[PDB]
Design a protein around this ligand. Sequence first.
Ligand SMILES: Cc1ncc(COP(=O)(O)O)c(CNOCC(=O)O)c1O
Ligand SMILES: Cc1ncc(COP(=O)(O)O)c(CNOCC(=O)O)c1O
Lengths: 473, 473, 437, 437
Amino acid sequence: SFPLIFERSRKGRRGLKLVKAVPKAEDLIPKEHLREVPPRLPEVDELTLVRHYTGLSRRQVGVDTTFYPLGSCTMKYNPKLHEEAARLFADLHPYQDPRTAQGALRLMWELGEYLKALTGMDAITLEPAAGAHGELTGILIIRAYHEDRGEGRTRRVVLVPDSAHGSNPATASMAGYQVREIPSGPEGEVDLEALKRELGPHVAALMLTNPNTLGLFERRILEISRLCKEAGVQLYYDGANLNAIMGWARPGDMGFDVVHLNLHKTFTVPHGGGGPGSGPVGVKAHLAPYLPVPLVERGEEGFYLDFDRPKSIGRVRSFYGNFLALVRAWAYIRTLGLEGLKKAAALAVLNARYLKELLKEKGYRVPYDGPSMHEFVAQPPEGFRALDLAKGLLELGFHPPTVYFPLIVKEALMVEPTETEAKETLEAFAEAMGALLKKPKEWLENAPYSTPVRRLDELRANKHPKLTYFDEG
Amino acid sequence: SFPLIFERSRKGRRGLKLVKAVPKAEDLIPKEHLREVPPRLPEVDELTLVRHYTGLSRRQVGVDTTFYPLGSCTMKYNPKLHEEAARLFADLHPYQDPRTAQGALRLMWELGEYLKALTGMDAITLEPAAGAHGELTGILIIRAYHEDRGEGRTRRVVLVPDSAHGSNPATASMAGYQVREIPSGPEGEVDLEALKRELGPHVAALMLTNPNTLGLFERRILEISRLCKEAGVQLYYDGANLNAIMGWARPGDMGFDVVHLNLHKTFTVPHGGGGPGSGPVGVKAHLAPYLPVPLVERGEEGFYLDFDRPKSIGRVRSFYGNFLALVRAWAYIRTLGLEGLKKAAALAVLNARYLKELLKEKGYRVPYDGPSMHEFVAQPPEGFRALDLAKGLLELGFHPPTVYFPLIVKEALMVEPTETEAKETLEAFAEAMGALLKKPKEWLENAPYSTPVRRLDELRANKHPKLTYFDEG
Amino acid sequence: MDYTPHTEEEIREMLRRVGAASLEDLFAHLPKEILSPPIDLPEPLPEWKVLEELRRLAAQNLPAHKAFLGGGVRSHHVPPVVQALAARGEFLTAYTPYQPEVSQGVLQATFEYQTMIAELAGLEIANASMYDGATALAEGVLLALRETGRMGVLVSQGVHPEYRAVLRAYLEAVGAKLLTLPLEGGRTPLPEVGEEVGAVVVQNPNFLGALEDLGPFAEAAHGAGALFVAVADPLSLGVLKPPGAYGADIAVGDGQSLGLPMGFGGPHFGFLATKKAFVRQLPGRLVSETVDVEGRRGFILTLQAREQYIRRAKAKSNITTNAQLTALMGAMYLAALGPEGLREVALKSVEMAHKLHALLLEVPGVRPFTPKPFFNEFALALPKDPEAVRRALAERGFHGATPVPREYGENLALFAATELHEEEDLLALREALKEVL
Amino acid sequence: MDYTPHTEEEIREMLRRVGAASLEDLFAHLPKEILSPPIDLPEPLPEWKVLEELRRLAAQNLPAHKAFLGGGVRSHHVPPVVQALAARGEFLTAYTPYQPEVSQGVLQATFEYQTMIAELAGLEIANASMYDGATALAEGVLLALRETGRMGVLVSQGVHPEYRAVLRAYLEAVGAKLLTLPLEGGRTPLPEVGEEVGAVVVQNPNFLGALEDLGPFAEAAHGAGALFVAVADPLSLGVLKPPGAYGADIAVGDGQSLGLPMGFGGPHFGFLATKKAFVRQLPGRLVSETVDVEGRRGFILTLQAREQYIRRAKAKSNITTNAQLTALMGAMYLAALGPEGLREVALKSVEMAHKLHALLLEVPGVRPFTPKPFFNEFALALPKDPEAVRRALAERGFHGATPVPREYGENLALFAATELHEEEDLLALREALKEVL
Ligand SMILES: Cc1ncc(COP(=O)(O)O)c(CNOCC(=O)O)c1O
Ligand SMILES: Cc1ncc(COP(=O)(O)O)c(CNOCC(=O)O)c1O
């Protein structure tokens, strides 16, 4: 049991006291503009505040406490060094004179240079706030590209594989595009024949992750690129799985026109229980003029925010980007260097393949298993549902991998251990997965048992949703 | 279950890498000085280090997570503001040019003045590392004083009440003195009659806390002072219970000649699982010349460390004192001011006096219940053991108060809530203590049950102690 | 340097176990031509050296602490207690809470965030957060258009220009149309709303800091069957009548003012509050109270058909990663201050801003622009170019005079003040301004 | 401002419950004359203003990051990962772990620290921590005198003068005698040890940074029936042969060199390591592994008869509060680097110090004093007053030349180098010294 911050409140109780002499409201703002009924915010002292949130953190797990093999998330260690690095630029105002923010602008420029170098793009925007935001940015760019060529009325559809993440097709809609989903081949890679059938003057772009969401590298990627080029279709790169190939291969050399990266995934920026993140977008020179404004350029006086871009799609969010996260990523790269990043990708791949071997030894299956990259997708043996095994893992002190995704594999167990997890950790995880199969169906169906809370009534929460403490409306 | 850092270890595994081009030993250090066998330090990666310690912290409780009514400890809230305050002075070297450390020296001076203002002392050293260290400093000061007046051979005994903290008599021994205990009267206060028969030219000092360790103010303190002064006996004030009177009464106006304060108790410096702390020692002018060196003074030039004190007892610890803790105490006083400190003392007393009433109504007894100050001492009803009630409390999600101290009360329950705890918390606590009296005897004796570990085998740890992981020797 | 735990002996064993000959061999199945890319990155550095470099860059900047710059972000006190709590590893390194049994911490905290935001705006419900204020506005408007089925939008020019720019991008992307209502005398005149208008948007306080009269805008919107969307600074809601009380259907804003570090523009967070009756169109994550098999209180993500995993193409938004950690920081701030504390901070910044305004009026050639009543920000007309003034000010050690784009008028500059500003800072700024002028 | 939660209504009720008419009425039984003391303290300030004042104070100081000052404290890298971990509320705000069932975090962490210190020292056991190096030494010698039953002590002048002063205060307090062995050629000559001597004390590296030959000292002590106490910098133990290997009976030192912020002198921690055979005489807390009622592994404080609570006047020491948190920071550092990482750090500092030694020797008038081989510190003979040089060096933005008391010689100054010092730092310093000279 744990109380709500609102239940801890006591009428009239004060917490922080930030004002010595509080002015009288009516001396500052006109009566009819004044709030009559105070918001029902909690009224607690600082000690209570600390115990509350510290108590909540203790009813929570994270990479700092548990192995998180979540495919499509790259739950790698978030170095504490980066938190210290970020506090160093906390006191900077986005509208302060640029000549006094050179350190910050320089960092933004360098980061952009490193990311382009690792991705093979010619220009880049560090403005978008997350991966999906980068997707919306890239697609809008691709759209502005076609429109600037008189095909804005014909290029109406976006193509995504049946294994694509939900945000890909969702983005198409936000960009006003129609979306068609192409099926995967028997190996789990792109079906060229089905692709060649869809390609045409009506397709604006093809969204892909490489490796794909099955953890497999698209071996015919160059061919796929060639087909797209002749049809005039823009090839979009979802960088969710960039961790698998950092420093070994670049999407740009694969033929991708536009790219988005997830700093809060591949580059150690902390997940923060949902966010915030950063979704930089890199593009080839022919799509560069459509980039959202402003761009960080290196000039004579120094670095500056460039707004003089006539074909720009405009603004995708306020200011210039989640700077403090950019600091985290800059720190990571300047720490590992090229060799460091390559080693990280190789071991990220080795941990995934090695663990794939352990789970198969335990009886788990892998429908699509060519040389697995940074992640892989397994299925439990007939008779076991992923949902239950996941809960069983929770009971055993482990955290389940991603479940029921990609959508093309029943009882999908999408596993991504990342390079920061140790050998013995992968083995302990595999052991736990093997043990759960030797547990009775009823035990699995009623797990967890020891967690702060057991399975929740998902039904009641959807039929009678109580969305706030006051449940107004 | 939880693994030892040594068990997480893996041969050859590396963690932090702070050296780019590591030189070869043979080139800097002669063969015969080089360590042959590496220390068996753990070999863990950073993620492992973080999970280990994050895990250990989750198997721990503190004021940040739990109500800690420990008598004699003043477990009051430690403002997070102070941690940020100490960070501002992390990079200062004790031997850097004082002309470049004026900010730190000014702070030391100001803190000294504030503490002398609250205690009524004329001069002060911020050097001692803890309360017990302050006692030694203060007792040596008294000895230097007696020896300087030619009574060093005759002043050989230190007097302490039967209710005194064990460090008091222990300190007398470290200082070469004999120690004699004087019993308390029927009210829990000093027995003036027993005191008069002990006072004489052979007594060097009388060590007292006020309020005493029963939480009772020594109402005859002025008479005690008069009696002491008449015999030429120095009155030492153990500041463990200063939180009960700060801003309301000063030991210096009570007749005390020397005082020691515990910044980590009364002034919010964190207890850190046992340490570190700070034990400032203040004195009346007649004892000032014997103060340990150096003292912070402000001269024509600026603030400086004064070492020119021919009668000083010397040095009691390295450098000048636990500066970083001093920053925290300075912050505390500059935040609250006199009225804030007075309010804290009053609410600390009110909390103790209120909780006392609640506990008596639940059936607990108070063998000495005159007007209770910042703490009070209770005992369970006939038939119950404090130890068992203590463990029962743990099982209930609370932390017990100090048990079995002072030594003059059987089954002592020494309770000190401090001013930062809320009325509802005091009540929930009493409600818990009450419910434990209704629990069957076999239940309490075998408590706790849900904690990370149940009752430990003290006898085993004492008969067959395993002091290190390697258990060498 | 790196964070990999693997020892050489472990890599050999793992290599042999997966049938690989070396690390390089793990990538042998990739097209020969894309391998060995010519990547140029600076040499790896130990952590203390990376910090040395960060500090050198930081040493190049002039800290904006106690700055008088405004336009959306201001130098407010960042309470260490809040930052200490948000630094807890559990909150910092957790992922989106999909396994609720082990995520009650973040789940309950988000539910509390929702409650606080809904209360602050005077509305009924709120999502788990949005990237920022601008994007929150865009999503709030898209919601109104989906709810009304219309494509027309009226936005006051009083809405921060960047917000209006972001809104336009999202709007034109889906075929919707936007009409900008220009300010008159610093405030936005009541427009006539047609039935093609699905949303009416107004910010309060507005970009120039002027308090707008929302009531009639809500009545005007409803009369035409259009939804009213209010853009409001959260800190200001601590003392100003919230949009909910004006009849607003949707409220959005950026959370930076709730004790968040300025951070040169990010990250912070956006909030979106609305009526429970529009919950089906609400984008983003939502936490609901519920119970476990033993009857214990619990919290979980709900109504997930509105999101991308389940609805994919028909999702209300593509938003996956949100801005949870910073939204929690806002919640901790709101909780730490309480209703009276928040009101105190808001009133204090308003007071200092007014004192500054009064002081600045004495500067030669300076003329007022933003009309009374204004909140904690205001625009003045300067006798010199605003960018030139900001620069000259920075040369003297001050951060002030944030340039207002010309669409509002010539030579305009914004000025703000907060609870951490004192009389002496105001005077010091004025003298600096008199020297530059 | 304050941290009190009580509302006026609660105080009102509580006051009635305890039978008091007001807050002041709670002190009515105190003598009337000591009440209402006129205490002079500055007026209260809000947290942001307090921080502002701390900032103004900090701005007055020239930070010592990367200083070349030595003499006990040095500017080493303080790893953020360690500080972040030592910042967890549970470690920060816990008290001495007397209720073991809920204190396994601190109890185990402390057990691991005892283990690491014992290992580093090449010994068998160590207590929970001492206040600091100087204090650890005093206690260490008192331990040896109790064990041998003697009253004589021989201390090398090579021991930090401050440690010797503290040692003297403690020793004279109990009637013990102390004889000082003067340094010859920067090293302490092997003394003749009488049977009245219970402890022979030597530091390695010594105050002047010179490496000392500990073997013959341990033998000279043992041959007379005395114990050998070694003072050693923990970081140095990562590469240098441990006193335990030389046959030392007791080892002590200050833990600042293990990644602890210099903090202008405190706090840090001191360590005391010795043989399991002398445990009965060991002062301070001691954690032992044990088991619980069901056989689960656990940790608890043990052999408490050595401490003040139980033994009072006959306790081994009056020590109650120790230096637990900082010692734990020390353990974290040790675990974070491991044996090799620690060895590398010690080596890099030794390397840079030597490189610096050679460079400064070129400055005209600068002559050597500390003989080879020295560690990461060394003293030089300068052509100008050391203090004057430090001041002059400081006016040029350099922290260096820590004055050596005349008891060691004239115009001597100590310099130190650490793992965060690079080639260019050494050169810039030399140039500066060249200038002041
Ligand atoms: C393949 C792939 N692409 C994009 C994203 C989204 O990036 P963010 O907007 O989250 O930064 C993801 C993330 N998917 O997780 C969705 C969830 O259900 O949590 C992805 O895997
Ligand atoms: C009355 C009293 N006097 C002294 C001390 C010691 O001060 P520090 O050296 O701890 O700062 C105390 C603390 N007693 O705690 C005893 C224990 O065993 O924890 C005190 O209460």
